[PDB]
C-alpha cells in the first residue's frame, strides 16, 4: 500500500514540477516550445547539422548538463520580462 502509493504521489510530483517549469517559461500546453533566449556558444559550439542530424538526445543530455541551471534561470527571466511587457502593451490604449 504505502510502497506503491508513495511512488504514485512521487510520479505526480515530478510531472507537476515539469509542468510548472514549462509554465514559468511560457511553454504551457506545448511539447515543442520556441523561446527568446539566445544560445551561448560556451554551452555548445556544434552546428545544427552536427546536433539534430548526427547526435542522439542522450549524448546531448550528457553534453549540456552542467549548464541547465543557467538556461532555466534565463528562461524564467525572459518570461518575466515578456509578461511585464505584455501587461504594458495591453494597458496601452
Amino acid at each position, epitope marked *: 500500500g504505502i510502497k506503491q502509493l508513495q511512488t504514485r504521489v512521487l510520479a505526480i510530483e515530478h510531472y507537476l514540477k515539469d509542468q510548472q517549469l514549462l509554465g514559468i517559461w511560457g511553454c504551457s500546453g506545448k511539447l515543442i516550445c520556441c523561446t527568446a533566449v539566445p544560445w551561448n556558444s560556451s554551452w555548445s559550439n556544434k*552546428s*545544427l*547539422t552536427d546536433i*539534430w*542530424d548526427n547526435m542522439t538526445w542522450m549524448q546531448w543530455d550528457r553534453e549540456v548538463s552542467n549548464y541547465t541551471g543557467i538556461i532555466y534561470r534565463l528562461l524564467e527571466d525572459s518570461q518575466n520580462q515578456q509578461e511585464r511587457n505584455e501587461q504594458d502593451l495591453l494597458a496601452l490604449d
Partner: antibody
Amino acid sequence: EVQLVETGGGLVQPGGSLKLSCRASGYTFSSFAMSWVRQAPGKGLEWVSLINDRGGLTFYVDSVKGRFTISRDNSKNTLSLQMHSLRDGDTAVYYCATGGMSSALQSSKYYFDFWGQGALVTVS
Amino acid sequence: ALTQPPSVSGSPGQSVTISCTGTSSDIGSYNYVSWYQQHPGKAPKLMIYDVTQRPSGVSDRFSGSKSGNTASLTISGLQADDEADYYCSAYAGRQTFYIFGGGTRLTVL
C-alpha cells in the same frame, strides 16, 4: 548532379487553368523547401511561390495569391503547381527551384540552390 | 524591387563589379543576398549566396560583399565564358519574400 525535370506547360486562353509538375532525382527529396520562379520573355526573374520541405506551409507572391496552389508529394518525389485564371501577365518560363527555407533544425537556406530546365507557359 | 545596373563591360583580365541596391528592409536588415549567372537559354546557376559565401562547384574567381544597403558581386580576371545575365536577389521578409533585380548583361570586351 541533381536533376529537376519540369513536365508540363503549353498554351492557355485568359481564364483557363494549367498544372505544372517537377520531378526530382539525385538527392533526398523530403529535406528541401522547393519553389517556383517565373521569367517572362525579355525580363528578369520573379519569385512566385514557396513550399516547405514537409508540404504543410505554402507562401505566394501577392500578385498570385488566391489563384495558384503549390503542392508536393514526398512519396513520388514530385512537385506540382496548379494555376487558375492565368492572366496575360502570367506568361513566362516557370523554373522549378530547390531552396528558399529550412525546417528550423537545419541551417538557413535563403537561396535557390538547384534549378530545373524550365517549363514554358503561354497565355493568349 | 531591387535596382541593378542594366549592363557593365570590361576587357579580359580586368575586374568588374555588379552592384545591387535595395532598401533597409531588403538588403540592409538581412544579410541573405545572393547572385545567379544565367547564360542565354538553359537555367540560372547559383554563384553567390549569403554576403560572402559561394556554393561548392564555383571557383574563387566569383566573390561579393555587402555594405549599407548596397550589395556587389566582383569577378576578377574575366574569361570569355562569363558572358551571361547576372541577377541579384535578397530575402525581404516573411511577407514579401524573395525580390530579384534586373539583369546585368556582361559583355566582355
